Design a protein around this ligand. Structure first.
Ligand SMILES: CCCOc1cc(C(=O)O)c(O)c(I)c1-n1cccc1
Ligand SMILES: [Zn+2]
Length: 197
């Protein structure tokens, strides 16, 4: 099986937002709207905004899951490579096999699906802080796209789903991710490739 990636705002008008970090050599996380693609360094903070048009009910949650973007790999579970799963960099909550972690939220829950074996991380929805119009989740990606025996240079998508208390779908959005040493340079390169095409 393969999780759906269809964008779905749903009844609450759910969608993602990203900061405008630029493409300087020093940038650690940067989002390309033209590519719908996040470029980030290993284990660095990736701020992802959640936006809604109306308030979802108490108990609504936000889940993140990675899948391979290419159809011929979509049924393979995205996991950390044989090196990183053994490097003992745990935060005490994320299983060492999980690619995606949530940073700084003790209510994050990590799921190994008993039927699909896919990994995901889910947090309770919290309303924006006073003076803010959206809520931000801080994600970390714990392997490079190039890691041998893991992603092995294959592109991935992150699927973000808004779910009710039973796990039923309320909204969905997604973005491609490249985890790399120089996200600013790679974003510039890929945007230029797109322009040349
Ligand atoms: C279910 C708890 C409340 O959830 C929200 C409420 C509001 C609001 O304006 O009332 C909001 O703007 C957002 I963004 C969320 N939200 C947090 C994560 C996903 C959606
Ligand atoms: Zn790795």
């Amino acid at each position: 099986s393969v999780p759906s990636q269809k964008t779905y705002q749903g009844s609450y008008g759910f969608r993602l937002g990203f900061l405008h970090s630029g493409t300087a050599k020093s940038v650690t996380c940067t989002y390309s709207p033209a590519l719908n693609k996040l470029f980030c360094q290993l284990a660095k903070t990736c701020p992802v905004q959640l936006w809604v048009d109306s308030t979802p009910p108490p108990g609504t949650r936000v889940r993140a899951m990675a899948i391979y973007k290419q159809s011929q790999h979509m049924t393979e579970v995205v996991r950390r490579c044989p090196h990183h799963e053994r490097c003992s960099d745990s935060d005490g909550l994320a299983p060492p096999q999980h690619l995606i972690r949530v940073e700084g939220n003790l209510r994050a829950e990590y799921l190994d699906d008993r039927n699909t074996f896919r990994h995901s991380v889910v947090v309770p929805c919290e309303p924006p802080e006073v003076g803010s119009d959206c809520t931000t989740i801080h994600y970390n990606y714990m392997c490079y796209s190039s890691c041998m025996g893991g992603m092995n240079r294959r592109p991935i998508l992150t699927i973000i789903t808004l779910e009710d208390s039973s796990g039923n779908l309320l909204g969905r959005d997604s973005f491609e991710v490249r985890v790399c040493a120089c996200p600013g340079r790679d974003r510039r390169t890929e945007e230029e490739n797109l322009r040349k095409k």
